[PDB]
């Protein structure tokens, strides 16, 4: 997307940028919506405003990235947002009630190119992921190299550590885990991510 797109906002939480190339993510989800240009600052964990509590709320322990870019001269229709509510929303929740019985709750804004910059339409994409002891199925563009043994080497079975690599023949795995866990919160006897051989 380097020669096609231009992002006004790229903020990540729980993982630094320029590290997503060498990482694998287990469960990845994408949320898409459309707001005004000045309301992008409200899409963050712990914020307040008309978007953060009545339309879309991020959890406090959020891991992922927030991407936004302006899309004037592309979205011209009239769109809606929640102006008031009896209570505030839970994280990652929706409220599709178009109107209450008493009074309408949905306010509207009109998007046109002649509208000022503060009121212009931008697209927001929010990603979320986590890392488990499971196959991830969403990885970066890394090439597998030759496996060497009996030397001090740095291995990259989705995690970096520099040790010596030998052959293990007395390991019982559960067919889900790659490394497991030790008594002192350590990981030992990693698995080859495509074979079943345990190192």
């Amino acid at each position: 997307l380097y020669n096609s797109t231009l992002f006004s906002t790229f903020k990540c939480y729980g993982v630094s940028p320029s590290k997503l190339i060498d990482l694998c993510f287990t469960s990845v989800y994408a949320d898409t919506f459309l707001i005004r240009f000045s309301e992008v600052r409200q899409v963050a964990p712990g914020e307040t405003g008309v978007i953060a509590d009545y339309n879309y709320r991020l959890p406090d322990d959020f891991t992922g990235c927030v991407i936004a870019w302006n899309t004037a001269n592309q979205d011209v229709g009239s769109y809606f947002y929640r102006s008031h509510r009896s209570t505030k929303l839970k994280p990652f929740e929706r409220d599709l009630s178009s109107d209450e019985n008493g009074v309408r709750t949905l306010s509207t804004y009109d998007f046109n190119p002649n509208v000022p910059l503060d009121y212009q339409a931008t697209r927001v994409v929010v990603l979320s992921f986590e890392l488990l002891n499971a196959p991830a199925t969403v990885c970066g563009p890394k090439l597998s190299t030759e496996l060497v043994k009996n030397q001090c080497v740095n291995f990259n079975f989705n995690g970096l550590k520099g040790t010596g690599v030998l052959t293990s023949s007395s390991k019982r795995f559960q067919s889900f885990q790659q490394f497991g866990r030790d008594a002192s919160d350590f990981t030992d006897s990693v698995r080859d991510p495509q074979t079943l051989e345990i190192l």
Partner: protein
């Protein structure tokens, strides 16, 4: 189309006590010979659950609260209990999610359902035993799931309950977590005392305000035309914020647990972090 009922009896909220039931895996990390404390939402040890059964002119499927998590356990023989519906106010003014087993496919779908008064599955004793309607209508929505096809037996009378299916439902960050467990039994009366862990099964993104839930049952229509109910029972318990102390062994399975808020002996066991206590006098934390 939904049926008509006038001879239904009011449910009796009987009380049965659980015992070391309703323990599930908190984390997806393989640990062996481990022992640690976890503060989460659990069903308390020795707490009492409510009993609902379908025996005769008594069909018990009321709308029950979904406070912080529900422990569900069913003792059945003829596959009476099929599934549940989750949501708020359970009508067309809001969105509701269903999890269903219509004896051919597993259905997970959240829409703007309009439920009738008594949602039941109807099976003909004759006529090669087909199914029937559940509710009235459901307009536009944004989720679907139909599993693979399978064949399900939908009539069996053994005289004793031979299946025990246990579930734990949780709602967190727009996800519905499902923990499942199965255990073969042979009982006649009620909920058997025991201990079995539950494994994580489903994680469906709903984005729903979930405050109430209702269960789907199945009845039988005789050859004359009247309805006939079959013997089944289920139990509902609620989770509370508690501190537990779980244990792991070889193959990484949970084999024992202690509820630290039950008795002074459990408090002593949780204070020193051991299942075995020697003779003496010890100070305990609150």
């Amino acid at each position: 189309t939904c049926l008509n009922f006038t001879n239904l009896a009011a449910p009796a909220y009987n009380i049965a006590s659980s015992s070391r039931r309703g323990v599930y895996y908190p984390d997806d990390i393989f640990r062996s010979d481990f022992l640690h404390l976890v503060n989460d939402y659990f069903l308390p040890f020795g707490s009492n659950v409510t009993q609902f059964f379908t025996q005769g002119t008594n069909i018990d499927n009321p709308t029950l609260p979904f406070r912080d998590g529900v422990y569900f356990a069913a003792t059945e023989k003829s596959n009476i209990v099929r599934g549940w519906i989750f949501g708020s106010t359970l009508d067309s003014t809001s969105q509701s999610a269903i999890i269903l087993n219509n004896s051919t496919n597993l259905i997970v779908r959240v829409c703007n359902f309009e439920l009738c008064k008594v949602p039941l599955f109807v099976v003909f004793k004759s006529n090669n035993s087909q199914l029937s309607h559940l509710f009235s209508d459901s307009f536009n929505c944004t989720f679907e799931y139909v599993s693979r096809a399978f064949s399900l037996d939908i009539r069996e009378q053994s005289g004793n309950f031979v299946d025990l299916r246990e579930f734990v439902f949780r709602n967190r960050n727009g996800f519905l977590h499902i923990y499942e467990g199965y255990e073969a039994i042979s009982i006649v009366r009620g909920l058997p005392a025991g201990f079995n862990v539950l494994k994580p099964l489903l994680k469906i993104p709903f984005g729903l305000n979930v405050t109430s839930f209702k269960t789907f049952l199945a009845v039988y229509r005789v050859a004359a035309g009247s309805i006939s109910v079959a013997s089944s029972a289920y139990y509902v318990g609620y989770l509370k914020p508690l501190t537990f102390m779980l244990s792991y062994d070889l193959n990484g399975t949970i084999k024992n647990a202690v509820d630290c808020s039950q008795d002074p002996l459990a408090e002593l066991k949780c204070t020193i972090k051991n299942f075995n206590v020697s003779k003496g006098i010890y100070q305990t934390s609150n």
